[model samples]
Target chain A: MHKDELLELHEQMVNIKDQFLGFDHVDETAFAAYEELDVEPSHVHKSKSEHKHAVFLLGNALAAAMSEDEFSSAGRISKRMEELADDAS
Target chain B: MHKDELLELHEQMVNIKDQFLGFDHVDETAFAAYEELDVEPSHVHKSKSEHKHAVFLLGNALAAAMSEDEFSSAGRISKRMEELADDAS
Candidate 1:
């Protein structure tokens, strides 16, 4: 995907995260992996590779959080996102 | 979004749905709106407008199913997608 596409996806995922943050039950720890990346959607100065990595990590975090909530498909989604993250790296 | 971007997003969401389907708890009815649209990701012959609507509806449906599973952010995501769907229409 182009940098623009990756940035769009990153923004979308961040929007999802913003909504999830409003809920008390969501485990903040699920976002640890992404937090460790030190990248944000506003970080357009970051390299395309960095944004790509951030997107997958954030996606994996969201999926992991959903999995923790016992959303049945979330575990699989988390796994897939993790794999994608690895590939991005 | 361009037609190609919409198609890419549609395919990604479909992949997420595929993983979710492996689990027993996801409510299939959440996808009713998208189903009613009668457009699949493979339906390349469909007009760009049709594909755009289908993509947002499918996105809304996925978020609805996630929301039903008690994923807190999903409700907001679903609402946003519905708005996008309306805009696309």
Candidate 2:
């Protein structure tokens, strides 16, 4: 994806997470992989590849968090997005 | 927004809402406006304008749901996106 597209995806995921944070019992460790990447949606100076990797990592984190909470399909999506994050990295 | 971009945004929102559906007390009526728009992320044949409108509506719905659940900032974002939806429509 282009930089702008990646940025938008990252932002949307961030907003999604904002909603999720309101819930109790989220697995904070689900964001471990994303934290290791050290990229955020606000990092406009980052390269496209970096942003792409971050987007996938953040997506994986969100999916994993939801999966842990027993949302159906999230585990599958988390693995799928994890693969994409690995490829992007 | 371009059709593809709008489609992606709509899809992401769908996934976000999927996670939310697992929660116990979601306000189903938060999606009323989007439902009235009658556009889904899978509707590839829809015009860019229609998809853009749907994206904004869906975004607003997500924001409204979170706002109702007491996620700070959601109400503000919902109103902002609702304005964009109005312009798109």
Candidate 3:
């Protein structure tokens, strides 16, 4: 996926998380994963692989923070991201 | 807006920032405002006014960080947020 598209997907991941979390901010696990993203070393600056990695990480973090019901939607995005990454690879 | 909806809007605000920023993290001003959000004391735990404040602060920070073109779309969201907050107030 293009950088913009990946970002959009990432945003969706955050959106779902925020909705489920309500007044709370991204939790420790989610924030930890998010912080690691900076140094994760992917196509962040300009690689499809890296882009996929970003989406994968974001999806994972959101999935972890979400309730089972919340994960119902979020997990789909995360799972598809891995599939997309695999195909891209 | 309800807390869930407000958080969704906040996520959109961040999503736009991440897109415009590309590889860059949210800048000092953006991050500063984001940090302020935690202590801003809104109805965050449970208040419409606070939710409006969160969105207002987010919209302002995004507007500050974005370039003219980047702000093009971002600006609309920002403006609308103020209006929403006004109506909400």
lDDT of 1 by residue, B1-60 (tens): 245654655566566555445445446566678788888889877875566566556545
Native contacts kept (model 3): 0.00
Q: Tens digits of per-residue lDDT for model 1 on A36-64?
A: 89989999889766775675666555544
Q: lDDT tens digits, residues A1-89, model 3?
A: 24555555455545544554554443444546655666233334555444444545554444333343244445688999999999998
Clashing pairs in 2: none
**Error at B20, model 3, angstroms:** 5.8
- Tens digit of per-residue lDDT, candidate 3, span B10-79: 5564664465455433344454665665623333465544445554555444434333324444567899
* Ranking, TM-score, top scorer first: 1, 2, 3
Model 3 misses residue A85 by how many Å?
A: 64
Q: For model 1, which pairs clash?
A: none
Once fitted onto the true fold, the runs of candidate 3 whose alpha carbons sit more than 4 angstroms away are: A1-89, B15-22, B25-28, B39-44, B67-89
Query: lDDT (CA) for every model shown?
Result: 0.62, 0.61, 0.50
Error of 3 at A31 (Å): 32
